Amino acid sequence: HRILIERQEKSDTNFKEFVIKKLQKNCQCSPAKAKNMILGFLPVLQWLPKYDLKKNILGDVMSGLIVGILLVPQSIAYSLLAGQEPVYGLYTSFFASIIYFLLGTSRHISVGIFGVLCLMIGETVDRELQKAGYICDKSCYAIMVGSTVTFIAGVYQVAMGFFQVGFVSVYLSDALLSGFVTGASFTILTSQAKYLLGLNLPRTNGVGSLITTWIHVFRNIHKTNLCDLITSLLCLLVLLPTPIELVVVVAATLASHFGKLHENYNSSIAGHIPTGFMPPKVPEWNLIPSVAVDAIAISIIGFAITVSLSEMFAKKHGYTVKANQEMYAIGFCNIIPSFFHCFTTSAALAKTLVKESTGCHTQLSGVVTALVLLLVLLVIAPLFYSLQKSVLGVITIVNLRGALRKFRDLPKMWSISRMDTVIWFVTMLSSALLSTEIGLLVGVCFSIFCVILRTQKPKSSLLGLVEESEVFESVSAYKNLQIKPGIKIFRFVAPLYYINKECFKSALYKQTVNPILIKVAWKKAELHTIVIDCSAIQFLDTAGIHTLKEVRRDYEAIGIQVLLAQCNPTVRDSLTNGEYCKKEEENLLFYSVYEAMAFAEVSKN
Amino acid sequence: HRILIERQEKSDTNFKEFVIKKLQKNCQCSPAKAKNMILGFLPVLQWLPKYDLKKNILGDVMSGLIVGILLVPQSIAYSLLAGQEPVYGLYTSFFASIIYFLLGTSRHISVGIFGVLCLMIGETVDRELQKAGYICDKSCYAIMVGSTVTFIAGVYQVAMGFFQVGFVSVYLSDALLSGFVTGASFTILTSQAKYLLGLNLPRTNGVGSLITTWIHVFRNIHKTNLCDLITSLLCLLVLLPTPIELVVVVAATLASHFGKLHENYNSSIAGHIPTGFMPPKVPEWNLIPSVAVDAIAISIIGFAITVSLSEMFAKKHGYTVKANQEMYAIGFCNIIPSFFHCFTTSAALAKTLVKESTGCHTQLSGVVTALVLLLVLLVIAPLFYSLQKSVLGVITIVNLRGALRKFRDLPKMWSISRMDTVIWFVTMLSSALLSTEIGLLVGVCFSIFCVILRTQKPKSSLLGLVEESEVFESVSAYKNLQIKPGIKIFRFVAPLYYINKECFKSALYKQTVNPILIKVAWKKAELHTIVIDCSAIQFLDTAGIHTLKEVRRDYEAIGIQVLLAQCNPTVRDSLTNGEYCKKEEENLLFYSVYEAMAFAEVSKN
Ligand SMILES: [Cl-]
Ligand SMILES: [Cl-]
C-alpha cells in the first residue's frame, strides 16, 4: 500500500493586477487615516497628552542632570576623536536628544554620540582635510565635511525607511556587530593614548593605522610631560573600580584651574565657544558625491545599532516600537541637525546604561538632559575650560571598558558556536587592524561565506530504523539501530547544489558501492536499493538536479535501485521540471523513508 | 511510550597525534612507490608502452592534419586578440600540445588557445603596455608581459595542485561559467568587429569597453574599405551554415595572393617570423608582482575549464582522469612554455569538438597536430602571408557561435531553475559590459548571495497528518490532511540563523497566535502545544539558539507549550550547549513529529 496524497491546486493569480488590487486594499489614498500617519510619524503627540506625570515626573527628572553632566565630557572627547571642535559634540548631543523626543518610540534609549560612529566620521573628515590640504580654517572645513556626511547618512536612513529596504539590517549579525564594536573600541583606545600621554604624534590614516600610531607612541615615549601622565594615572586608578565620572571631572577641572597646571605645558581644551548657537549653514551640496560611500556604512551601523537597542528595550517591557518609525527618527536625527553644526548620532549603550541604572520609562528625561546641555551650552561652557585632556582619555577608556570586556566571553562563545566565535574574532581583528569600514565589510562577507562553508562540508550518514517505530536516524550518531542488508538509506543534511554536489557524490560513493569503479571493473572483466533521504535537502540547483539524475543513472547501470524519499514540495517541483522521473514512471519518489524501505523490501520478494 | 535512543560515544581522539599517525600511514616517505609517483606525474610512460597501435593509429593520424591546419588561423587570430604577434599563437599551440602529451590523462581533450583566456591576457598586456608607454619594441614588451602572466598562472595552478586547494573550482558554477564564456564571446565579437570592418579605432580599456568600441565603430563607419567588408560578407555567407574552415581560409589566401588585394589598402598579416624558434627568454622576474592579480583569474578559469572538460570526457567513457594530475599538467602547460615565447593555454571546446567529430581515443593525435604546427612553423608560415584579416574575423565569429547559441536555451533554463538563469544572465551582462575579470567576480559572489537569498526567504508552513500513516506534510502544498485542533506543527525549511531568525519568528507568529500581542493584551486587560519540525533545519547559529529559547519562553508565558521534533544531532548538540533544555527537564525534544503529536495529545488528557 503506497501513499496517494493529492497536491493542492496552485494559485493562477500571479500577474500585477492582483498586486495592484492589494495595494488599493492597502489604501494608499487613505481618507481620515492621514491623521494616523501624522501621529505615526510624530509619536510625540501620542503619549505626552496621555502622560502619567504623577507617577513618572520624579523618575524622568531624576538623574537627568547627572546624565547631562555625564554627556558633557563624552562630547568634549569624542568630538576630538571625530576631528571636530568640542562645542560640536555638545551641539550634536543636544540636537539628537531634542529631535528624538519629537520622533521616537523606544522611550528608553539614549540617542546621541556613539564612539564607533565618531571614529568613522573622524576618518572621513581627516581624509577630506588631507585631500584638500592641511574661509575654511581647517576646523570649519572639518565641521562642514562632518555635517555633509551626517546629512548623507540621514538621507540614506530615511530612504531605507521609506523604501522598506531596512532588511539589510539582517546581514549585520549580533556577533559581527559585537566584534566590530570591540575592534573600533581598540582603535579608539589607541587614538586616545596620544592624548593620555600628551604627545604630538602626526595623524595616521589607512590600513594598519593602529600599528602606526602605536609605533609612533613608542618612538616618542621620551617626550612625556609626566604631568598629564600623572593626572591620567590618578584618574585611571580612581575610576577603574567604577556619579563617579562627574565627581572625577569636576575635581580634575577644579584642581587644574586652581593650580594652573597649564604652566607645565599640559595640553588642555580651549574656550571653544560662548553661548553660541551660530546660524545654521546648509551642507556642501557639491561635496556630497565624495563622501557618500562612507555615509553608507555610517547609516547602516547607526540604524542597525539603534533598531537593535530599541527592539531589545521594547521587548524587555511594553514592546510597542515600530522599526520603520525608528528608521525615520534616526534619519531625521541626522538630517535636521546636519543643517546645523552637528555630526552623526546613534544609540549609545554606555550612556543608555547610565540612564537605565537611574531613570524611568519616560523619554522626557532626555529633554531634561538637552536642557542641561543647553544650560551647559549657554553659560557653563567656560567653566569647563582648563581640562587636563588626560581625564578625557581616562573617561573615554573607562567607557570603552564595556565593549572591551567582551574578550572575557570567548570561552563561553566557543562552548556555544565555534563559527560565530571565529566570525567575531575575524571582525575584531579586521576592525582593530586594517580599517573600521573595511573591517565591517570583511566581517559581513566572512559571515556569509561561513554560511557557505557550513553548507560546503555538511553531515552525511547512513540511517537506521529505531526499534518498534517508523523513525530513521543516523547510525554514525546514534546506537543500536536496525539496518537491513541490501538497503542503505543515505541522509545528506544540506541543500544539493553546485557547491556540495561533488561532496554529495563522494559521500554517497564512499558509503555505498561507488558504482563507477564497479562498472569499470565489470567492463574490464548484495546491495539492490538505495534510499536518499531528501528531508534535509532545502533546495535543488540545476547542478543538484543533474547530480541526482546522474546518480540514479549510474546506480541503475550496475543494477542498484535509487529511491528518493521525503522530498520537499519545491524539491519535487524541481525534479519534475528537471525531467528526472520521466512521465508516470512511478516508484521513484516516496513521501517517507519508511514507505521507500517497505517498497524496497517488497521488490526483492 | 517515548523513544529512548542512546547516542554513540564520541571519539576522544582529536589531537594532532592521530593526524600525524595517519600521515605516516599515508607513507610520505614511500619505499618503492617513488616509481608510482613518477609514473603518476608522467602519465606518458603508462599508455604509450601499452598502446594498441593496430586499432588506434589510423584514428589518431586521421584528422590530425585537419586539426593542425584548423589550429592555424585560430592562432593568427586570438594572438591578435591577445595583443601579440601571430607567431606567438602558433608557439603556444605547439608547446601546449607537446607538453600535454607528456603530462595528460584526459586523452580526448584539446589543450591550446582559449578565446576567453586570450581576451584576458590581452587586457593585462595592453594595461602594462600603457602603464609603460605606447629593447622592448612594443611587441617585445607585449610578449614579455604575456609570458610573465602565463608563468604566474602556471605557478598558481601547480601550487593549487600541490597544496590540494583545488576545491576552489566548486565556486565556479556551470551556469556561471556558461554566462562568463557567453559574455567573453560577446566581448571577442565586439573586438573582432574592428578587424572585420577594417577600421583603425584606438584601443579601448576599462569598464564599458564593449560600449566604447561599438561607439567608435559607429563613429568611424564612413571609413570603410568596402573590400575587406566584401570579403568578410562572402566568408560569413559561406561559413554560416557550417573542413569548411580550412577550405575557406585556403581559398581566401590564394585569392588574396593572386589578385593582390593589398593594393586596395586591405589590412593583412605580415611576415611574422621564419622557421624561427628563437632561444627562450626567462620571464621578467621583476614585473611578477604587478600582473599577479590577473594571473589569479586566468589560472582559476583555465584549470576550472580544463578539469570540467576532462572529467566530462572521462566519465563519458573510461573515467580514469585524476584531478590533481590535470592540475599539474595544466600548470606545466603554462610554466615551461612561458620560458619560451608563449601565452596561457587551456582546453578549448570548439577545437576539442573538431577532434571529437573526427578522431579517436588517443592523445598522440595532438602530437600530430603539433607536428603539423611545427611544419607550419618551419616552412609553411610564409604561405600564410597575405591573409585578408577579415576571414580571420569571420573565423573567430563562427567559432564563438558555439558559445553565442546559449541564448536559445534561456526558456529551457527558466523552466528548470529560475535563480540559476538569473545568475547566468547577471554573469553574462557583467562580462559583456564592465570587465571580463570583474564579470567573473560579480558572478561568483552573486551566486553565493543567491544561496543566501534562497535561505533568506524560505518555505514555512503548517503540517498535517496523512491518513492512516505517521507522515506529516505541508497543508499549504498538499490536500486533505488531518490537523487536530489545539496542536499546530510548524515546518520551517531553512537553517535557523542570524539572517532568517526574524523571518522564522514572523512566520511562526503569523501562523500561530503571535504570543507577544496576546501577552500585551492580557496585561492591558484553543492552542496548547506547538511542534517545531526541525528536520529541515540544517544548522543553528547563536542567533538561532537564542531565537528558539525566546520563542519557547514567550509561548510558555502565554501558556502554549513548545516542542521540538526531528532535530539533527548537530542541532541537538547546539541546543544542549546553548543551555536550552536546562538539565533533565525532559519532554522538550522529540525524535519524530508523531512522537511529539502523541505526547501533546496525551498531555491534555
Ligand atoms: Cl561607544
Ligand atoms: Cl573560445
Author numbering:
A (entry chain B), B (entry chain A): 52 to 185, 211 to 318, 334 to 616, 645 to 724
From the manuscript:
SLC26A2 is a vital solute carrier responsible for transporting essential nutritional ions, including sulfate, within the human body. SLC26A2 is known to function as an electroneutral anion exchanger, facilitating the exchange of various substrates such as SO42− and C2O42− for Cl−, hydroxide (OH−), or even with each other. Like its homologs, SLC26A2 forms a domain-swapped homodimer. Each protomer of SLC26A2 can be divided into three regions: the N-terminal region (residues 1–104) comprising a few flexible cytosolic helices and loops, the transmembrane domain (TMD, residues 105–540) with 14 transmembrane helices (TMs), and the C-terminal cytosolic sulfate transporter and anti-sigma factor antagonist domain (STAS, residues 541–739).
We purified the overexpressed SLC26A2 in Lauryl Maltose Neopentyl Glycol (LMNG) detergent with 150 mM NaCl at pH 7.5 and then determined the structure, termed SLC26A2-Cl-, by cryo-EM. The final reconstruction achieved a resolution of ~3.2 Å, with sufficient quality for model building. The resulting model covers residues 52–724 without several flexible loops containing residues 186–210, 319–333, and 617–644. We found that the vertical position of TM3/TM10 in SLC26A2 closely resembles that of inward-facing SLC26A9. The result shows that our SLC26A2 structure is open to the cytosolic side and closed to the extracellular side. Notably, in the structure of SLC26A2-Cl-, we identified a distinct density corresponding to the Cl- ion in this cleft. Interestingly, this Cl- does not interact strongly with any surrounding residues. Within 5 Å distance from the Cl-, there are five hydrophobic residues: Y129 from TM1, V167, G166, F165 from the end of TM3, and L491 from TM12. The primary binding force for Cl- appears to be the weak TM3 and TM10 helical dipoles with positive charges pointing towards the substrate-binding pocket. When such distance is between 3.5 and 8 Å, the Cl- ion is within the TM3/TM10 cleft and considered bound. Combining data from three individual runs, we estimated that the substrate-binding pocket is occupied by Cl- ~82 ± 4% of the time.
